[PDB]
Amino acid sequence: GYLSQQQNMMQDYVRTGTYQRAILQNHTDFKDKIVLDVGCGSGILSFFAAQAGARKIYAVEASTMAQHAEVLVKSNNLTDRIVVIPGKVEEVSLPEQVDIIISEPMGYMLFNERMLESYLHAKKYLKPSGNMFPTIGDVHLAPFTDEQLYMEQFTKANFWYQPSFHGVDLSALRGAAVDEYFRQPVVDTFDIRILMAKSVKYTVNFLEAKEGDLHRIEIPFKFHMLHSGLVHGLAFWFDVAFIGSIMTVWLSTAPTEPLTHWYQVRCLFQSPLFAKAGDTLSGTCLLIANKRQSYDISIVAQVDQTGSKSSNLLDLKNPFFRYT
Amino acid sequence: GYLSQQQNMMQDYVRTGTYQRAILQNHTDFKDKIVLDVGCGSGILSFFAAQAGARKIYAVEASTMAQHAEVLVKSNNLTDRIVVIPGKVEEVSLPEQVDIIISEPMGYMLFNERMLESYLHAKKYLKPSGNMFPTIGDVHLAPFTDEQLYMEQFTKANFWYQPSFHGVDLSALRGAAVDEYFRQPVVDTFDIRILMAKSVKYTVNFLEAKEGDLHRIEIPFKFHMLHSGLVHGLAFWFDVAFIGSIMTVWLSTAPTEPLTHWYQVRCLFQSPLFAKAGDTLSGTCLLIANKRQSYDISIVAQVDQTGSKSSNLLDLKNPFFRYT
The missing domain is CATH 2.70.160.11 (Hnrnp arginine n-methyltransferase1)
Incomplete structure (x- = not known):
């Protein structure tokens, strides 16, 4: 829930800069595509997907950090492109299948915190030949x-x-x-x-x-x-x-x-x-x-x-x- | 319930030394009395009451930390004096009313973590003539x-x-x-x-x-x-x-x-x-x-x-x- 933990994660240039580079440099994977953003940890990846010209981005946020994501979508004039869906990925329903899933599910030895299980779970929403970032x-x-x-x-x-x-x-x-x-x-x-x-x-x-x-x-x-x-x-x-x-x-x-x-x-x-x-x-x-x-x-x-x-x-x- | 946190508390010499000093200098408040030790921080206070002469010390510990306490009671040859009662003071039953209650219930700003409510709750075990350390x-x-x-x-x-x-x-x-x-x-x-x-x-x-x-x-x-x-x-x-x-x-x-x-x-x-x-x-x-x-x-x-x-x-x- 804390903006201080979000900030700290955004403040890591390797993390935020590499995700942004990965999305903008591969803009054709994102241009006019439907996107699922699972668990906006730093909370910013849906915006990178929009900068690459995504058609629609579903952002599933789990904590109270869901009304904060809502403030940012509105104040960046992206209400028509980014839909914030509060809850867990294992409990929400998406109105449609996505072309690509994006997330930051890595913990300490990659696996700690077990966020990768939600990430894999989300593939129920992935079109058969969709992609995943990270792959x-x-x-x-x-x-x-x-x-x-x-x-x-x-x-x-x-x-x-x-x-x-x-x-x-x-x-x-x-x-x-x-x-x-x-x-x-x-x-x-x-x-x-x-x-x-x-x-x-x-x-x-x-x-x-x-x-x-x-x-x-x-x-x-x-x-x-x-x-x-x-x-x-x-x-x-x-x-x-x-x-x-x-x-x-x-x-x-x-x-x-x-x-x-x-x-x-x-x-x-x-x-x-x-x-x-x-x-x-x-x-x-x-x-x-x-x-x-x-x-x-x-x-x-x-x-x-x-x-x-x-x-x-x-x-x-x-x-x-x-x-x- | 980690030994490492016990250790960090114990190694605070001002905390540990002053508890022992409060108990031994008032040995007469302990000598031949029944003591209730609530919710061990270090786990050490029952041993100070034993050094002071208490007849019986009931040591209520909730965490798996109760097993560790039990080991120290045996190796220190105090099985006739210190009795570990696992669980919480709000739940456990005691064989008898006590003459004194001892605890380390203080957090940051004194009040943090609310250990003081369990400490005050234990007063149901306190004889009318009884005392509390800290008071x-x-x-x-x-x-x-x-x-x-x-x-x-x-x-x-x-x-x-x-x-x-x-x-x-x-x-x-x-x-x-x-x-x-x-x-x-x-x-x-x-x-x-x-x-x-x-x-x-x-x-x-x-x-x-x-x-x-x-x-x-x-x-x-x-x-x-x-x-x-x-x-x-x-x-x-x-x-x-x-x-x-x-x-x-x-x-x-x-x-x-x-x-x-x-x-x-x-x-x-x-x-x-x-x-x-x-x-x-x-x-x-x-x-x-x-x-x-x-x-x-x-x-x-x-x-x-x-x-x-x-x-x-x-x-x-x-x-x-x-x-x-």
Whole structure:
């Protein structure tokens, strides 16, 4: 509901500028077409669709931020072109099928907040050969070494390892504090030189995907170690592409690209793994959607040349925002 | 119910040390008595009552935090003294009436999160001769001058005065935008030299207050100005006293005292008020309990000599943390 959260999202130039570039540069995908805008987060995408000369734009807004979208449509003299439909996409009805769907459904590792499920759900309104902006999403994973990060977890949990905090013995809760800290994905950016291998990419094609494909995401991985060292976890980021008729525009949140409000996400292993250069780290990353509009993340990895194995179970609902 | 939040509260030494000091210095209010510990923040207070000699402590904890508490009770060998009762005080039953109730029910501006209503509700368990720790809460408010803070909130707000942000006119939402920014209480510390008059005190006596008294809190005020200049808003903080039989121990969050995780809070006026040294600034601060476990705050302030008046609505539900 807050205009301050809208503003903050609009203020990210990468986000707003890239969406606008994607729409205006592919204006023939939009010119005299019918458009569905699902969940106007920054709230501004319906206007870009009108700047590209859309015939009609249905804007589904879910919160009280629906009468605000109404104020903006009226004061920009676009009442004849933009229709604001309050409610959820799974509960509203559109008077007609659309040529294209647009949205900003990306959360922390692409998937967090589960807005992509509404996005896919909206395809019931898509003409059989319509398009989607974004069209595809690429989750990248890569192993990292970060001894300071890993160490900081114990420093914090070891608060509980004292037999007389104000005369109280806290140490029986040290195991639970360690578990809890290790279950938090870390949202922060990093130096790319911490990456110990080329990333593995998992693509979700939004045109082909069904809503149910997101309830459980299995990502196998095989890493070929570029440097010898202790692997402390996996790092996550994502790219999305808008694949129009004129061109493909990419939005990247990679650590090599300018920083966005998505940053990057790291999941630590319980126990680091020694992998030399040339070794293989294989395993699997399993995302299971949960009742808290988030994901449980299951990671298991082994050094194939050695058999030494590690894992973690994380919940994306309680991340540690480490950046400042 | 995270251990990490327990830990953050526990590590506030002013909070933790003063609770222990209030309890041990009044050991005689605890020695051989029945204690009710309501809704653990840190979870630590039952252990202070045990150190003080209580015969029995019923520790009501709602969150899964009840399991963690249970683990500490066993490892500290206090199973005969401290009994965890899961659930809420409004629901649970207790084997017997208690001699004293202890809690950490204070949020920002003392009142935020409304833990005080559960605290007052627990008085149904209190013997007529009983006590409560804390026993009173002093809210202080004082007028302040801070040009930098005011300009800065108006700066964020000014985003929405743009007639063309990426081609879109936002200016229709500018009034809605500044109003929203000015409803955020600013949580931060400040130099004491910015205060324009002696604070005014509003005392809530928890022993005497009924639960519904806290749904509506009217705070009339009149300051005698000690410096001339623009008044940009009202600063708030709170003291709580533990009025034991042996001594009264004050826990203060005043800007003249060491910093606590409560910091202090400032409500800015939509427009500053000019006032001469010697002039009187009177009005009311009015807190109304809302659905979101917080308060609507309405502040009306007048210079009595002049008729200059500035009134402001606030919601303690989304504060601005300026100590970022």
